[PDB]
RNA sequence: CGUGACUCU
RNA sequence: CGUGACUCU
């Protein structure tokens, strides 16, 4: 019988997929093992972002990083982590940069976004 | 004003609201210049979904509503005027049910793209605006 | 629906 | 319940 994922913020749907009241029951790093189940349940699903005013980008998740926001690194040829780009080019300072990122688009394009700035786009089935 | 949005819904179901019909059945005929004038001033820049082409639920924004009915209407068909109708029924087996009603001209205005109303549903989440 | 774009990460 | 676009017409 079909069923719509809620249209929520990425931390709640983790929260949900981790079996957390909250998300400060978590203020460490997730383990692999809360990485692995975290990503079967997000992967392939379309998020839409918050940190860009109205203009809320829509991408589907291939992957969640194996590093924290903090120190997750992509090109920019130099590096830089995410947590720092998102405050050096869009000024946020992320709340949880101890979670992980999703990795959106192409996997080549290396785009990763914050849970923080997502969220579950609405009409999508549960399977 | 305070923001309201209008109701997705099929185009046809649109126009007999905007014509103060029950039903299109009543509308057996093509338009008059009024009841043209009327529906476009209501559709001109909204957004639409079609509805012929499976779950390719392609979206385009109205520009114009055509003066001629879509059994009427033509564009340059690779070069050939082909009217919208018989484009209908020969590209996608569409025989159209209200070939008297016009068309909604959408898009860039110079690629002649006009879409036959019962193929149209207004998309939502489209601000009603005073 | 899907996807590309809004110089992104 | 941002804009634009293709798979048109």
Do not use: W
């Amino acid at each position: 019988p079909t069923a719509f994922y809620k249209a929520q913020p990425v931390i709640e749907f983790v929260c949900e997929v981790l079996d957390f009241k909250s998300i400060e029951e978590q203020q460490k790093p997730l383990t692999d093992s809360q990485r692995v189940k975290f990503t079967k349940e997000i992967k392939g699903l379309k998020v839409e972002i918050t940190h860009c005013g109205q203009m809320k980008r829509k991408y589907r998740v291939c992957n969640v990083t194996r590093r924290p926001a903090s120190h997750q690194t992509f090109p920019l040829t130099v590096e830089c982590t995410v947590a720092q780009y998102f405050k050096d080019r869009h000024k946020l300072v992320l709340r949880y940069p101890h979670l992980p990122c999703l990795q959106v688009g192409q996997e080549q394009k290396h785009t990763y976004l914050p849970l923080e700035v997502c969220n579950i786009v609405a009409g999508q089935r549960c399977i």
